[PDB]
């Protein structure tokens, strides 16, 4: 009288990483000089 | 406090003891002996009870080998500490006389009936061994280390 989804299992969690900070083209184009995003 | 905890932990670690009760016991007997030496020092020299009584006390502590036989003065018997008594106890004489590999092995080899002291065999590791009786600490006769039968594991090994 059992269910297989009901049993406790081991949970494997890789370390969560997220994508970097994605500023839009027009915002980064229209923001002033001391803060202008400098990407090579 | 903490000075007593590190002090008595140093005593229960230097010499292989089971609790702090034996430490307090040894400091109690040293308190009585050192007390008697103090109240003998209260009188002058040529007070004949300081001469004969203090002479008898330093002869008894030379005889049980706590006070070293070189120094013969009641100030030098005031200057004692509990590592002298624990250094004179039987367990530490088993280890310092090298019958045992460690001090806890020495207390095992005393509650275990493997050692004798002279004619007696001694179960108590708190036995205040006399300086004259220091040399005759050895293994007991029916033990596997003093001849005799080779004991349980080798009996079940031969069978």
């Amino acid at each position: 009288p059992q269910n297989p989804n009901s049993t406790y299992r081991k949970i494997e969690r890789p370390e969560r990483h997220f994508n970097p900070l994605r500023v839009p083209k027009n915002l980064a184009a229209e923001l002033p000089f001391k803060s202008q995003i400098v990407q090579t | 406090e903490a000075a007593r905890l590190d002090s008595e932990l140093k005593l229960v670690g230097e010499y292989g003891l089971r609790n702090k009760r034996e430490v307090w016991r040894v400091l109690l007997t040293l308190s009585k002996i050192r007390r008697a030496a103090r109240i003998l020092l209260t009188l002058d020299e040529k007070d004949p009870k300081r001469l004969f009584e203090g002479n008898a006390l330093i002869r008894r502590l030379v005889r049980i080998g706590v006070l070293d036989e070189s120094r013969m003065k009641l100030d030098y018997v005031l200057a004692l500490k509990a590592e002298d008594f624990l250094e004179r106890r039987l367990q530490t004489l088993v280890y310092k006389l090298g019958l045992a590999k460690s001090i806890h092995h020495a207390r095992v080899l005393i509650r275990q009936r493997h050692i004798r002291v002279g004619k007696q065999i001694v179960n108590v590791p708190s036995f205040m061994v006399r300086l004259d009786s220091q040399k005759h600490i050895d293994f007991a006769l029916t033990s596997p280390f003093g001849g005799g039968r080779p004991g349980r594991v080798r009996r079940k090994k031969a069978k």
Binding site: - | D68, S70, K96, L97, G98
Partner: protein
């Protein structure tokens, strides 16, 4: 060359007795070569030599390294008395005796080289 000559009125006797007790506590390096190893390695707490050496040059070398390591040395006048003081059945010509952290033997070494310091 035996200018730290120990005196037969019981200073020799306390030296040889402490030799025997260190022999029973296994704190004892016997013979000139093993004495030399203990002094050069710096384990040595005190060192006795024997002035009854038939050429004494063969033990004259260790007062140098004992002066370098600053350990007290003293001569007893009989290598046979030193030899059965050790318990060897041969003649021990020069003996060195070390110490540990906690022993009444270490106390006896301390008082003994206090007397050797009263000589030198």
């Amino acid at each position: 060359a035996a200018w730290p000559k120990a005196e037969d009125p019981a200073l020799v006797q306390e030296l040889l007795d402490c030799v025997q007790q260190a022999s029973h506590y296994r704190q004892l390096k016997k013979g000139a070569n093993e004495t030399t190893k203990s002094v050069n390695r710096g384990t040595s707490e005190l060192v006795i030599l024997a002035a009854d050496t038939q050429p004494l040059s063969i033990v004259l070398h260790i007062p140098l390294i004992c002066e370098e390591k600053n350990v007290p040395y003293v001569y007893v006048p009989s290598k046979v008395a030193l030899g059965r003081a050790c318990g060897v059945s041969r003649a021990v010509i020069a003996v060195s005796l070390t110490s540990n952290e906690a022993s009444d033997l270490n106390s006896k070494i301390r008082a003994l080289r206090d007397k050797v310091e009263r000589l030198a």
